[PDB]
Design a protein around this ligand. Structure first.
Ligand SMILES: C=C(C)COc1ccc([C@H]2C3=C(CC(C)(C)CS3(=O)=O)Nc3c(O)cccc3N2C(=O)c2nc(C)oc2C)c(F)c1
Length: 561
């Protein structure tokens, strides 16, 4: 079966799409080489369509079936509930795509009668029709990157059903996709961990091995590798739970009418083609991808003869750490792993490489690195190449965007050199300049949208990373070099310039008192030689962070609050 078939109609925009980073004084103060920063647009959709379109050959075997049985057995212990229309409405993001039926996200969030009447009709139709494919829209994502001269990445494609259907997905499946993944994959389910917990997991997994070896496995176009049988298997797993009778009907209908495939319509209403793989923009994308990746990977580890594996799975992202059998044996085992994954429909982009140092493994864009606290104690933390974060931060300074990656990056990468010295300094300075310090902003954590107050960053950071996040120094030479080269590449001022700026920002924050002063004291202690004593933040204990690290929701149109 082909992942997609196409009619020749274009993937079309629904508004003008700005291509190049605009010139703005505040954005330019972060990053000057604006010609190297671009947004993907519908203009490159054809290139992406070509890449994501291929035939899937899938052959399953006894290891695969053995793992599937384990998963179904674990699922049978789960109880999940329906959400009410009101509950589902409250999970809809404020800038969720408008319905084609005359209402938008705001109407959903305020339980407007036109929205609710339509939602109720969609629900009824799910209960009454289990077969007619549901329409989806195909759009080109507008995402910002820095050039790497094949130059520019083509746009990723998002495929999503109508707003009314999305609310019904929440009613049928929000509780399932929030509970089931952790229950059936246990410690391997990556989205249950804060950043601090994720680094603890990876480090302990590595340390526990006599002679560790690890790798990341990069499936080429994972969504396109997911077969109709994969998606029906997911449905069978969902049905192992104790569910409400109406949920069972809706879940089957959603599977058969939406998740397994369906027609692709552009923003002009034209038929673009037909999908027989994973939809990138449905509630079950993260759960389904994670389950499918886990099942295939766990089976493939057995096929590969890998010894004492520890896996960490987040959607299509897979890390395995295991006991080395020797260099040639390990290399052969990774070839066998790849052959198994390939048989299961998931061949690699880049072939996996065995790594014998933890820092060399990249997972969810990130690698483990080490710094030191004030007493010379090694502290592990997750970092990443800052290029994309910085490029997006510059864009988000020049233009108002619905969701701010910069805030998510500060939250998730708070212990890093670059988040601390550059992102914190820049954004506190911009927020002060624009008189926006007190304003909550939308960002994403594991794909769910949150409204977060920047003045709450210090206790958030303490909870996610530990108090040491405000005291790290003596970073690794390789990390320092990577950041430095990024700054030269992008025309970002050097770190010592940011330090000078941070001293001013800090004094301004301290002068304001309250939460602002806590931001000055804790976030910018690094910028002064005469340091303040950083004691545990009282507010940290009081923060309700329930649901932050429960499940992944990228593509699933979820808002938490
Ligand atoms: C704890 C760590 C420090 C390391 O582990 C992480 C770190 C971050 C995420 C979140 C996020 C990001 C950007 C952020 C921070 C700005 C927001 S985020 O937390 O949602 N990036 C990434 C990646 O760069 C790579 C993979 C997945 C995601 N993420 C997704 O959820 C996601 N899934 C899809 C299909 O696409 C995306 C963007 C994650 F899941 C795991």
């Amino acid at each position: 079966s082909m992942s997609y078939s196409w009619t020749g109609a274009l993937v079309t925009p629904c508004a003008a799409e700005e291509q190049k980073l605009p010139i703005n004084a505040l954005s330019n103060s972060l990053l000057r080489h604006h010609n190297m920063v671009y947004s993907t647009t519908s203009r490159s959709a054809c290139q992406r369509q070509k890449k994501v379109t291929f035939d899937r050959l899938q052959v399953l075997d006894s290891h695969y079936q053995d793992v599937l049985k384990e998963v179904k057995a674990a699922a049978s212990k789960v109880k999940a509930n329906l959400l009410s229309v009101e509950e589902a409405c409250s999970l809809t993001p404020p800038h969720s795509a408008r319905s084609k039926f005359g209402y938008g996200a705001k109407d959903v969030r305020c339980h407007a009668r036109k929205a609710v009447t339509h939602i109720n009709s969609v629900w009824k139709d799910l209960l009454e029709d289990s077969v007619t494919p549901i329409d989806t829209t195909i759009m080109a994502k507008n995402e910002v990157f820095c050039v790497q001269p094949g130059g520019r990445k083509p746009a990723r494609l998002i495929v999503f059903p109508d707003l009314g259907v999305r609310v019904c997905e929440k009613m049928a499946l929000y509780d399932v996709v929030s509970k089931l993944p952790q229950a059936v994959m246990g410690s391997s389910y990556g989205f249950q961990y804060s950043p601090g917990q994720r680094v603890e997991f990876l480090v302990q997994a590595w340390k526990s091995k006599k002679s560790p070896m690890g790798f990341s496995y990069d499936t080429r176009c994972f969504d396109s590798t997911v077969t109709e049988s994969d998606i029906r298997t997911e449905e069978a797993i969902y049905q192992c739970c104790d569910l409400d009778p109406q949920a069972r009907v809706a879940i089957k209908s959603l599977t058969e009418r939406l998740y397994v495939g369906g027609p692709l319509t552009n923003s002009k209403g034209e038929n673009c083609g037909y999908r027989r793989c994973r939809a990138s923009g449905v509630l079950t994308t993260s759960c389904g991808n994670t389950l499918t990746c886990y099942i295939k990977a766990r089976a493939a580890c057995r096929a590969a003869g890998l010894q004492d594996c520890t896996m960490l799975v987040c959607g299509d992202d897979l890390v395995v750490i295991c006991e080395s059998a020797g260099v040639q044996e390990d290399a052969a085992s990774l070839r066998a792993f790849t052959e198994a994954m390939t048989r299961y429909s998931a061949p690699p982009g880049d072939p996996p490489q065995p790594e014998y140092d933890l820092e060399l493994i990249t997972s969810c864009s990130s690698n483990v690195s080490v710094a030191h606290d004030g007493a010379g104690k090694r502290v592990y933390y997750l970092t990443r190449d800052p290029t994309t974060p910085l490029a997006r931060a510059a864009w988000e300074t020049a233009r108002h965007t619905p969701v701010n990656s910069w805030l998510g990056n500060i939250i998730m990468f708070a212990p890093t050199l670059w988040a601390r010295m550059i992102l914190m300094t820049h954004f506190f300075s911009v927020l002060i300049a624009r008189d926006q310090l007190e304003q909550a902003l939308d960002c994403e954590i594991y794909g769910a949208c949150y409204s977060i107050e920047p003045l709450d960053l210090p206790p958030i950071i303490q909870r996610l990373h530990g108090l040491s996040a405000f005291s790290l120094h003596s970073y690794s030479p390789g990390e320092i070099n990577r950041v430095a080269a990024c700054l030269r590449k992008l025309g970002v001022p050097p770190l010592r310039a940011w330090r000078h700026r941070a001293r001013s920002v800090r004094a301004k924050l301290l002068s304001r008192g309250g939460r602002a002063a806590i931001c000055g004291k804790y976030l910018f202690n690094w910028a002064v030689r005469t340091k303040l004593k950083l004691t545990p933040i009282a507010a940290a204990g009081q923060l309700d962070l329930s649901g932050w690290f429960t499940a992944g929701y990228s593509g699933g149109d979820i808002y938490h609050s």
